[PDB]
């Protein structure tokens, strides 16, 4: 069983793929908190552009909301909703400057 | 439309997920080469363990083979086969030491 070339290329080319982002990233100065789960499944731009002078980056986007447990150690905890950025379309633009 | 908590948790917990790895990583001193595509789609261990003292890591593995274009700049180029490591099962083991 061998993955054929065009099939590899098509599957690895810059496109939106289910990715698992840490929430500390997506939410900046929320260190008065710990999250459960600590990460979340977001669609996000991935793979390569078959080139060193090209990077894969978001052109279209869309917000999704998620039930997260916002623990605040030594005080308390509650389930709240928490929106994250989700990439809907990708494009191989030129490396930043 | 709101992702329910247990559904987020189940989807983001340490498990094998289609990931897009650079080939320079998986193949070390092959810098007498450039690859097309430059990356490949491998199943790989991802998401979190809902904890700072725990990391997600491979326990079962399995090799997949792929048709890759091995360019060798200024000499030539040919399609060859190239095996990569693929994670079949994941587990939240304790952070290294």
């Amino acid at each position, epitope marked *: 069983e061998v993955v054929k070339f065009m099939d590899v290329y098509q599957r690895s080319y810059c496109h939106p793929i289910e990715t698992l982002v840490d929430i500390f990233q997506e939410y900046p100065d929320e260190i008065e908190y710990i999250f459960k789960p600590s990460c979340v499944p977001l669609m996000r731009c991935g793979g390569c552009c078959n080139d060193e002078g090209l990077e894969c980056v978001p052109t279209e986007e869309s917000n999704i909301t998620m039930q997260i*447990m916002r623990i605040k*150690p*030594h*005080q308390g905890q509650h*389930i709240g909703e928490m929106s994250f950025l989700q990439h809907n379309k990708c494009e191989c633009r030129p490396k930043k400057d | 439309e709101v992702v329910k*908590f247990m559904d987020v948790y189940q989807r983001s917990y340490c498990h094998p997920i289609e990931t897009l790895v650079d080939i320079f990583q998986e193949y070390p001193d092959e810098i007498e080469y450039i690859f097309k595509p430059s990356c490949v789609p491998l199943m790989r261990c991802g998401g979190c363990c809902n904890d700072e003292g725990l990391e997600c890591v491979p326990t079962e593995e399995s090799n997949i083979t792929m048709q890759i274009m091995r360019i060798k700049p200024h000499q030539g180029q040919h399609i060859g086969e190239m095996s990569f490591l693929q994670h079949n099962k994941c587990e939240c083991r304790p952070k290294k030491d």
Partner: antibody, heavy 120, light 108 residues
Framework: EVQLVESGGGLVQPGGSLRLSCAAS????????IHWVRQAPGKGLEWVAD????????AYADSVKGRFTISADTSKNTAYLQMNSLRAEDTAVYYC?????????????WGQGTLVTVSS | DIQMTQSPSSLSASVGDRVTITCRAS??????VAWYQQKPGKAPKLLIY???YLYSGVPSRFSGSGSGTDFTLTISSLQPEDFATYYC?????????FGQGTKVEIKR
């Protein structure tokens, strides 16, 4: 202020059933993990069951599963331990608790407790 | 049972003594040790968690060590109201865990 208030303990012929109740107040049981922990006369602590509504996730101590079913009703902010098929060694002071990630899995509010006693 | 081995099972100590109950955990890392104080015919009251931290309103005379698997509740200046059964609990993966207990009493 938080408090847990249990009720429903009493006397039951062996092989019968009771319904213990754990009324909470001053916090959502939804957001936390609610436990039942019992104590036979003069002996120590034995965890029996627990519910975490947010996760939809329950659990049962080996000696008790099949017969007891823990449950919650978050509109009434009350948890419940329906016990069937009751035995002499089940006889105890049933305590209900609150566990959280905030206090690193520790059980920080317990109710006063009811006494279940299983005799003929 | 995710074991926990509490010792001593019971003890005496005159007022003001340095009393120290200890506990011995299962085979995992896992720092989720709590300590409770149970006065007779009464609900357990939480004292210390994650092994060192100290629930609100708990007196300064209680502390705890998280040192490998060897944990220690420690009452610097034992008091006439500290008579009770103290239970430890390793609670990281599950609650099926509770020390056997320690009836502390005053000597006088």
């Amino acid at each position: 202020e938080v408090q847990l208030v249990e009720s429903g303990g009493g006397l039951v012929q062996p092989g019968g059933s009771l319904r213990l109740s754990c009324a909470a107040s001053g916090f959502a049981i939804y957001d936390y993990d609610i436990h039942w922990v019992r104590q036979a006369p003069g002996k120590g602590l034995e965890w029996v069951a627990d519910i975490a509504p947010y996760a939809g996730a329950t659990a049962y101590a080996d000696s008790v599963k099949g017969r007891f079913t823990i449950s919650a009703d978050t509109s009434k902010n009350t948890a419940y331990l329906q016990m069937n098929s009751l035995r002499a060694e089940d006889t105890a002071v049933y305590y209900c608790s609150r566990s959280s990630y905030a206090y690193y899995a520790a059980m920080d509010y317990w109710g006063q407790g009811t006494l279940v006693t299983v005799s003929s | 049972d995710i074991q926990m081995t509490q010792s001593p099972s019971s003890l005496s100590a005159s007022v003001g003594d340095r009393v120290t109950i200890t506990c011995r955990a299962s085979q995992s890392y896992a720092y989720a040790v709590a300590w409770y104080q149970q006065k007779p015919g009464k609900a357990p009251k939480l004292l210390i968690y994650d092994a060192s931290y100290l629930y609100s309103g708990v007196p300064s005379r209680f502390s705890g060590s998280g040192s490998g698997t060897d944990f220690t509740l420690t009452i610097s200046s034992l008091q006439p109201e500290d008579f009770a059964t103290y239970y430890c609990q390793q609670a990281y993966s599950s609650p099926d865990t509770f020390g056997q207990g320690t009836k502390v009493e005053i000597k006088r």
